[PDB]
Amino acid sequence: GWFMPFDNWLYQLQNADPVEISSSGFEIAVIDYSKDGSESGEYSPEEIKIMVDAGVVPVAYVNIGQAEDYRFYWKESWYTNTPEWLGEEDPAWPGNYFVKYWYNEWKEIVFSYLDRVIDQGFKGIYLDRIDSFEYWAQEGVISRRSAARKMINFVLEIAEYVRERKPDMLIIPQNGENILDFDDGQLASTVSGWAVENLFYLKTIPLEENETKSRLEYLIRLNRKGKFILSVDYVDDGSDSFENISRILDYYEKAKRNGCIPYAARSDLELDEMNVIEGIQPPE
């Protein structure tokens, strides 16, 4: 039934090696735009073309809902003279900061990041912290509809920007899929696909059946429209215990039965390795 145009995928945000990935057998790889996150680690065009040459589609992670204090755009002056749009540090991810993504200064930061990513030769972008719209709504800073509309429009503007230069660029948001409650249909046509974390499992622990089914409502609808879905659940505890590999198999089977292409990732959340599991990932 399902639209499933990739056989597998890779999510690796630290220590990604183009050579390793080239000959792994993963068809699409979502990595960072730099080897350590910093400006000086930026992959060269050559390093990215290794993957392209091998038939892998490389895609760049870009966080559009938080500022990250190690990136090329961060300024020392923000500590002493803090912009309005720069907010509190994320308790769960030190060095990340919620931003008022609707302010021009932020949007233009992100556009300047997409500029580097286009020049490097990446073939999609993977957009994290769509869910910042929920954060600001919940802080009571702006209304939820206002937040949702602003984030939708920002993703639309992101799409316009990169497709002016690279018309077939893939666009994959991560989470915040319920933002589609406020879409008129344009966002759902504009993306190539959507990615989610924690659909069947929160690390090693399975989720209530209704929570899962709620998310799937959005994803199923997007699948029927020709958009692929990448799942990543953080299910591999690192052992080759029975309990562990049973869980991996269970996650793989639930993913594929609902049109989600799975990647079982380490329970540590570090996404620091290529993460192969003998005759499961990649698949036979």
Author numbering: 29 to 312
Authors' description from the paper:
Endo-galactosaminidases are an underexplored family of enzymes involved in the degradation of galactosaminogalactan (GAG) and other galactosamine-containing cationic exopolysaccharides produced by fungi and bacteria. Whereas the fungal enzyme belongs to family GH114, the two bacterial enzymes do not lie in the current GH families but instead define a new family, GH191. The TIM-barrel core structure with fully conserved active-site residues and a negatively charged substrate crevice is conserved among all the families. The putative active-site residues (Asp156/Glu225 for TmGH191, Asp323/Glu391 for Env-GH191 and Asp157/Glu225 for FsGH114) overlap well with the experimentally verified nucleophile and general acid/base Asp189/Glu247 in Ega3, Asp196/Glu222 in Sph3 and Asp160/Glu223 in PelAH.
We could not detect any binding, or enzymatic cleavage of the GAG oligomers, for the T. maritima enzyme, which raises the question as to whether the T. maritima enzyme is an endo-galactosaminidase or whether GAG is not a substrate for this family. The TmGH191 crystals all showed a varying degree of twinning. The structure is composed of tightly packed trimers stacked on each other along their common pseudo-threefold axis. A pair of adjacent trimers form the asymmetric unit, with the two trimers having slightly different orientations (11.5° rotation around the common axis). The stacks of trimers pack into a sparse honeycomb-like structure with wide wells around the pseudo-63 axis and a solvent content of 82.5%. Sph3 has a rather less charged surface due to its activity on neutral GlcNAcylated GAG. A closer inspection shows that the substrate crevice is partially blocked in ‘apo’ TmGH191, especially over the active site via the loop between βi2 and βi3, with Trp121 bridging the active site and blocking access towards the putative −1 subsite. The TmGH191 crystals prepared in this study were soaked with GalN and GalNAc, and a data set was obtained for a GalN-soaked crystal. While no distinct density for a bound carbohydrate was observed, difference density in the substrate-binding crevice of TmGH191 suggests that something has bound, although it could not be conclusively modelled. Some flexibility in the side chain of Trp121 was noted when comparing the native and soaked structures.
